[PDB]
Amino acid sequence: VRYSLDPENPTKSCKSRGSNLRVHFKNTRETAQAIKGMHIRKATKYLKDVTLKKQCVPFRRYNGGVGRCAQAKQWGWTQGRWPKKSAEFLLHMLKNAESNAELKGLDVDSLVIEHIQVNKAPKMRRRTYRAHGRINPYMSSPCHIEMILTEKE
RNA sequence: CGACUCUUAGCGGUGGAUCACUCGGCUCGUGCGUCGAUGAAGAACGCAGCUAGCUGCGAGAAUUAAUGUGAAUUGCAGGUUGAUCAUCGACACUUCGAACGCACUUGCGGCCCCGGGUUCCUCCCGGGGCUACGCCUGUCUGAGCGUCGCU
Ligand SMILES: [Mg+2]
Ligand SMILES: [Mg+2]
Ligand SMILES: [Mg+2]
Ligand SMILES: [Mg+2]
Ligand SMILES: [Mg+2]
Ligand SMILES: [Mg+2]
Ligand SMILES: [Mg+2]
Ligand SMILES: [Mg+2]
Ligand SMILES: [Mg+2]
Incomplete structure (x- = not known):
């Protein structure tokens, strides 16, 4: 599958991908920007802390x-949230990347998330009912998620 | 440095433009110029080993016979003295519908002939053929203090 960014060392790099994932795109982008510079153990621990509301995702663009929380001041930001579903989806995908690395025989504890991005999936359609006999869209905003690990010691 | 924002480029998404295709339309021209009470057009309901739609067909129901052709149909199974296709002149063609026994509930009949029932004794059941309107010619039966003739 044609990835967006090529790894600098494809022997020591593994990939993971997910398409048409029923998650909010904006929450997924902000938490992927939080994950983007991390080692895999730190990323797994911080994604568990997001679901347990111990550490937050700083909301920077969207x-x-x-609202503003106290935990965002570790990121040099004021607004943060805790997207639970979005933290679990790219934890399942991070476990998939772990399983793909173990298949290639890469070292488990040296994996650093080198590339990650979130794209907009095709929007799927539902319908809501408004006043004076008007019917309005209730569109979902799903996402494609893409990540590449790299052994970085 | 970092976040955020702006511009450009690479790659990836969203979207389906452009281009190239076309068993489709539009227009012109030619030949023929054919429906129906022997039941038309239209509609309804059914019919396939696995079948919803489209198409084809009518209880003989994706067809029967005959003729031409000549080894297939096919998504999967099953099984040359002619498989399949095409032609189509034979046979068949459920219900409503001008729609025809009376009505349109799918209801009530009447007449005749058969088979069970019975042993012609009417019942009951099943099957078949008739039972609409107008109008032409002829037949039969009639009507009139209509016009007469005769006993
Ligand atoms: Mg903003
Ligand atoms: Mg506001
Ligand atoms: Mg409402
Ligand atoms: Mg209303
Ligand atoms: Mg770009
Ligand atoms: Mg059928
Ligand atoms: Mg035949
Ligand atoms: Mg033949
Ligand atoms: Mg009634």
């Missing part, structure tokens, strides 16, 4: 009306 932050309109997003």
